[PDB]
Symmetry: none
Subunit: 40 residues, 5 copies
């Protein structure tokens, strides 16, 4: 009789992200709405 | 009689992402709506 | 009698992504709606 | 009597992607709606 | 009596993709709706 419902719009049981950014350069211009882990 | 429902719009049991970015260059211009792990 | 339903719009049990980007170049211009792991 | 239904619009049990991009060049212009792992 | 249904619009039990891109060239212009692993 029991009902179990799980709804996840997004689920990760495990997520790993690794990002490396190195930038040398002059006069970059940017507009970013959301930034994670980034070099402009 | 029991009902189990799992709905996931997106599910990853495991996700791994590795990104490396190196940029040398002058005068880049960008508009980015979302940025993750990036060099403009 | 039991019913189990799993619906995933997208599921990866395992996903691995590796990206390497190096860019030398001058005066790039871009508009990107979503950016992951990228060099403009 | 039991019913099991799995529906996945997209499923990968395992996915591996490796991308390497190196670009030398001057004055590239791009509009990209989604970018992953890329050099403009 | 039991019914099992699996429906996947796309399923890969295993997928491997490797891409290498190197580009030397000047003044490329592109519009890309989706980009993965690419050099403009």
């Amino acid at each position: 009789d029991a009902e179990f419902r799980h709804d996840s719009g997004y689920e990760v049981h495990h997520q790993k992200l690794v990002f490396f950014a190195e930038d040398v350069g002059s006069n970059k211009g940017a507009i970013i709405g959301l930034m994670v882990g980034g070099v402009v």
